[PDB]
Amino acid sequence: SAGAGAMTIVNRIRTDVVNVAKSFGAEYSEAVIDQIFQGFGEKFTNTGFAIRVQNKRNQKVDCNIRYGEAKENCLAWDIARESGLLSDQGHPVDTLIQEMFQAIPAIAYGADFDINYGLVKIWHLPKIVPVEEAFKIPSLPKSVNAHIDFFKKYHLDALCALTVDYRNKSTNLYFDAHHPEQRTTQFYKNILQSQQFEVPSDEVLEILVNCPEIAVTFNWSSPGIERMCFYTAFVNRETVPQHINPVLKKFAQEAPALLDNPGFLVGWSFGPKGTYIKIDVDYHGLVVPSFFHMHNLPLP
Ligand code: DMA
């Protein structure tokens, strides 16, 4: 009743988020959750909302909640500012999402929150554009321009999203992984070895060949790529590769969703740290179809 029986969608979401966190042992703050939901709870109920767990080595699972919607303006910024979730840090991140929306028209935006912290990222989603359109953005890390030849070499020509991480002080460029070389396990070996990142098992490599989206993370403190991530979606619980990792298995089987038959998005992250898995449940069933659609792929 307070947390069960008839209840608003938003209260159902809150309860489910806390349940996930408790089940996976993630930390959270009641004050932060409340602050997030006061500002964003209506968005979570009506748009493409997801709950994520991720499993960094030698630390607790983290639980994040996120959403995206097809609006051309960055509606999250005002909401986060007014909620007390986004204070200036005296840093390039402070104006970066604003610069992104000035430089490249968006067809959607989103935001992401760690329930033990607050707002972590805001996302900008344009139509797919040449990656060179990003070089207009004043406050991007210098490392981005320096990787022009790397992007060309690995067929990272088609930019499909941008994000600003206010917590980590980093930015990600996301690419539509359209090129047939990206359907080969050798591509993933090569791109990882180019950054001296560890190469995963053959089993994981055979999963990566279906990845429609590649993120690359840059920061202002170093000249190199901080980490990269390969995203793969699965249309239901059973098709998630549960045997690869116990968090994948548990989350596919037990993650809550309002829709009876949800899909999932899995991010395989690699770094030098940086190597872990992220898994999101498609809580209302809107995210996975949208993901395939944004990458010009038929729905599997
Ligand atoms: C496909 C998709 C929804 C990507 C969002 O970026 P992310 O949350 O995985 O970024 P990061 O984990 O680098 O903060």
Q: Is 154 marked within a binding site? A: no
Tokens of 283: 């809580």
Q: What angle do CA 10, 114, 51 make, to 5 degrees?
A: 50
CB 157 within 8 A of CB 142: no
Sort strands 62-69 and 108-114 into parallel, antiparallel or unpaired: antiparallel
Experimental method: X-ray
Helix %, strand %, coil % of the chain (to 5): 40, 25, 35
Cβ–ligand 1 distance for 112 under 6 Å, the answer yes
174: annotated binding-site residue? yes
Contact 229, 268 (CB under 8 A): yes
For the Cβ of 172 lying below 6 angstroms from any atom of ligand 1, the answer is yes
List the beta strands (DSSP E) in the chain: 48-54, 62-69, 108-114, 118-125, 129-130, 158-165, 170-176, 213-219, 227-234, 264-270, 276-282
The CA R_g of the chain, rounded to the nearest whole Å, is 18
Cβ–Cβ under 8 Å, residues 125 and 294: yes
Q: Which long-range contacts (CB under 8 A, 24 or more apart) does 239-243 make?
A: 240/264, 240/266, 240/279, 241/207, 241/266
Indicate the top mutation candidate among 51, 66, 231, 297 to test ligand 1's pocket, ranked by most ligand atoms within 8 A of CB: 231
Torsion of CA 222, 217, 168, 160, to 10 degrees: 140
Helix, strand, or coil here: 76?
helix
Q: Are 171 and 137 in contact (CB under 8 A)?
A: no
Both tokens of 55, joined, read: 């499993």
Give nearest CA residue, ligand 1 atom 10.
172
Print burial letters for 132-164: b (CB count within 10 Å at least 16), e (below 16): eebeebebbbebbeebeeebeebbbbbbbbbbb
Q: Does 152 appear as a known binding residue? A: no
Contact 116, 161 (CB under 8 A): no
264 touches ligand 1 (CB under 6 Å): no
Reported resolution in A?
1.8
The reply, when asked if residue 121 is annotated as ligand binding, is: yes
Which of ligand 1's atoms lies nearest the C-alpha of 120?
14
Contacts 24+ apart (CB under 8 A), 173-176: 173/131, 173/134, 173/144, 173/215, 173/216, 173/218, 174/213, 174/214, 174/215, 175/131, 175/151, 175/213, 175/214, 175/215, 175/216, 176/128, 176/212, 176/213, 176/294, 176/295, 176/296
CB contact at 8 A, 195 and 224: yes
Is 295 close to ligand 1, i.e. is its CB under 6 Å away? Answer: no
**Is residue 133 classed as helix, strand or coil in its secondary structure?**
helix
278 is in an annotated binding site: yes
Q: Is 167 annotated as a binding residue?
A: no
For ligand 1, atom 12, the nearest C-alpha belongs to 278
Q: Which atom of ligand 1 is nearest the CA belonging to 174?
A: 4
Helix (H) or strand (E) holding 250: helix 246-254
Domain-wise residue ranges, the chain: 9-294
Cα 216 to averaged position of ligand 1 atoms, centre (Å): 10
Alpha carbon distances (Å) from 122 to 49, 208, 272, 295: 14, 26, 25, 20
Q: Ligand 1 pocket, 62 CB below 6 A? A: no
The sign of the torsion formed by the CA atoms of 243, 286, 114, 164 equals: positive
Hey, which residues does 65 pair with through a beta bridge?
51, 113
CA distance 190 to 184: 10
Query: Does 212 sit in the ligand 1 pocket, CB within 6 Å?
Result: no
Q: Please indicate whether residue 213, judged by its CB atom, sits closer than 6 Å to ligand 1.
A: yes
